[PDB]
Design an enzyme around this catalytic site. Structure first.
Site, short mmCIF file in Angstrom:
data_model
loop_
_atom_site.label_atom_id
_atom_site.label_comp_id
_atom_site.label_asym_id
_atom_site.label_seq_id
_atom_site.Cartn_x
_atom_site.Cartn_y
_atom_site.Cartn_z
N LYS A 178 1.66 -5.74 4.57
CA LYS A 178 0.23 -4.75 5.08
C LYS A 178 -0.04 -3.40 3.92
O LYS A 178 1.23 -2.99 3.64
CB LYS A 178 0.10 -4.45 6.47
CG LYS A 178 1.36 -3.53 6.55
CD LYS A 178 1.90 -3.36 7.87
CE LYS A 178 3.31 -2.00 8.50
NZ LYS A 178 2.50 -2.09 9.91
N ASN A 221 2.43 -1.08 3.90
CA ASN A 221 3.94 -1.06 3.51
C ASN A 221 4.60 -1.25 1.93
O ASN A 221 5.24 -1.28 1.27
CB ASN A 221 4.67 -2.31 4.29
CG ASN A 221 4.91 -2.21 5.60
OD1 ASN A 221 4.69 -0.87 5.88
ND2 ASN A 221 5.42 -3.07 6.41
O1 LIG Z 1 7.64 5.67 6.27
C1 LIG Z 1 8.27 4.67 6.71
C2 LIG Z 1 9.57 3.58 7.21
C3 LIG Z 1 9.37 2.32 7.82
C4 LIG Z 1 10.72 1.87 8.54
C5 LIG Z 1 11.37 2.51 9.14
C6 LIG Z 1 10.96 3.78 9.31
CL1 LIG Z 1 11.75 5.20 9.81
C7 LIG Z 1 10.26 4.30 8.32
C8 LIG Z 1 7.77 3.76 5.41
C9 LIG Z 1 6.45 2.74 6.44
N1 LIG Z 1 5.97 2.45 5.11
C10 LIG Z 1 6.24 2.88 3.89
C11 LIG Z 1 6.82 4.04 4.38
C12 LIG Z 1 7.91 4.50 2.83
C13 LIG Z 1 7.25 5.74 1.97
C14 LIG Z 1 7.83 6.48 1.47
C15 LIG Z 1 8.94 5.04 0.57
C16 LIG Z 1 9.31 5.47 -0.62
O2 LIG Z 1 8.57 6.64 -1.89
N2 LIG Z 1 10.46 4.47 -1.19
C17 LIG Z 1 11.10 3.32 -0.53
N3 LIG Z 1 10.19 3.14 0.73
C18 LIG Z 1 8.98 4.06 1.02
C19 LIG Z 1 8.82 3.74 2.05
#
Ligand SMILES: O=C(c1cccc(Cl)c1)[C@H]1CNC[C@@H]1c1ccc2c(=O)[nH]cnc2c1
Lengths: 20, 337
Positions: free
Chosen positions: B155, B158
């Site tokens: 999505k 993500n």
């Molecule tokens: O905040 C997030 C998240 C996703 C799953 C579990 C928890 Cl606890 C938090 C993810 C959701 N979609 C993207 C978010 C996110 C934001 C930034 C980065 C990043 O800068 N590097 C790697 N992964 C990320 C994910």
């Protein structure tokens, strides 16, 4: 318009995953 | 050739899969700066690694919350898979570790923010813009699926956009390595294939259905099945009906009808020719898959970058302290993390 219907809906923000 | 590439890729992946890296940093090595996103069982924060000055995104999961949400095995899947993969459009896991209270995954920081934020703001992407992003997902899925992985949460929320304007796929919390069929109800309502809703037993074809939802949402500005409540979304998904904006090209509609196909024996991605039915579709006629993989194609936009550590491409979230209990929680459950 479909766009207007979408923008007025409650699901234009981030959507949560589901699970059981 | 593609086959040759995937063979060596599988060889690399398996070495790591069978012998996962573990305990490769400690909380005190990082300075916490700001929350980049937040929801069930944890949050992701921008941090600075003290010994290097590099910035990273650190996902913090509360072990007790993971247990109550019944996500123990999915969490072990996420970390074991993320430490083993390597692809230009997959965010890298640089360190992982755990303490009495939490699990931590330290990933490359992707400063351009979520595709979601940019797509909602601009309204919709042009077909060439959407095709540029879709191409990267097609290749990423070709890679993951060849390792027997199913991703299961495609999505825009993500997908992050990097400083070159390319996609980094993140959020591996429902990814699973499985040969044959699996049954877990997981995903996000707008993106679920009919077979997941109908509790049928499913496989990588659900990721190809999700790609159709994503291309539609990028090109239209709204998803193909939306309503105010998930149940009404599911009823639309299983109906077999889909309607396209009148500005969609005929090639785009034809690709989406083949991806958003309820009948598995007819769903693109899932036929005898596999991903090639997608790569060779007319909507992708201009796509040079090698140039995309090599990041040689000019991106539709480069996110604004105001300096190292800048978070302006991310929403603000309420900040909460990282509490580490003096007692170990759920040690047995997460011993392999
Ligand atoms: O905040 C997030 C998240 C996703 C799953 C579990 C928890 Cl606890 C938090 C993810 C959701 N979609 C993207 C978010 C996110 C934001 C930034 C980065 C990043 O800068 N590097 C790697 N992964 C990320 C994910």
């Amino acid at each position: 318009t479909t766009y207007a219907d979408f923008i007025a809906s409650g699901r234009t923000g981030r959507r949560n995953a589901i699970h059981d | 050739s593609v086959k040759e590439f995937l063979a060596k890729a599988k060889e690399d992946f398996l070495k790591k899969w069978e012998s996962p890296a573990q305990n490769t940093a400690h909380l005190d090595q990082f300075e916490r700066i700001k929350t980049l996103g937040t929801g069930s069982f944890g949050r992701v924060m921008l941090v600075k690694h003290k010994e290097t000055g590099n910035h990273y995104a650190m996902k913090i999961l509360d072990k007790q919350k993971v247990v109550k949400l019944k996500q123990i095995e999915h969490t072990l899947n996420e970390k074991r898979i993320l430490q083993a993969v390597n692809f230009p459009f997959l965010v890298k896991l640089e360190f992982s570790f755990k303490d009495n209270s939490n699990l931590y995954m330290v990933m490359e920081y992707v400063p351009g923010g979520e595709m979601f934020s940019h797509l909602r703001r601009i309204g919709r992407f042009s077909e060439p813009h959407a095709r540029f992003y879709a191409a990267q997902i097609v290749l990423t899925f070709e890679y993951l699926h060849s390792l027997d992985l199913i991703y299961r949460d495609l999505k825009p929320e993500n997908l992050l956009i990097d400083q070159q304007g390319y996609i980094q796929v993140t959020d591996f919390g429902f990814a699973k390595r499985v040969k044959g069929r699996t049954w877990t109800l997981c995903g996000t309502p707008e993106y679920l294939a009919p077979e997941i809703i109908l509790s049928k037993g499913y496989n990588k074809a659900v990721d190809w259905w999700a790609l159709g939802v994503l291309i539609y949402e990028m090109a239209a500005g709204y998803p193909p099945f939306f309503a105010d409540q998930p149940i009404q979304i599911y009823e639309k998904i299983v109906s077999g009906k889909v309607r396209f904006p009148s500005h969609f090209s005929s090639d785009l509609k034809d690709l989406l009808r083949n991806l958003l196909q309820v009948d598995l024996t007819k769903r693109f991605g899932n036929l005898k020719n596999g991903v090639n039915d997608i790569k060779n579709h007319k909507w992708f006629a201009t796509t040079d898959w090698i140039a995309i993989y090599q990041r040689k194609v000019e991106a539709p936009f480069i996110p604004k970058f105001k300096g190292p550590g800048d978070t302006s491409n991310f929403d603000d979230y309420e900040e909460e302290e990282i509490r580490v209990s003096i007692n170990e929680k759920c040690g047995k459950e997460f011993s392999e993390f």
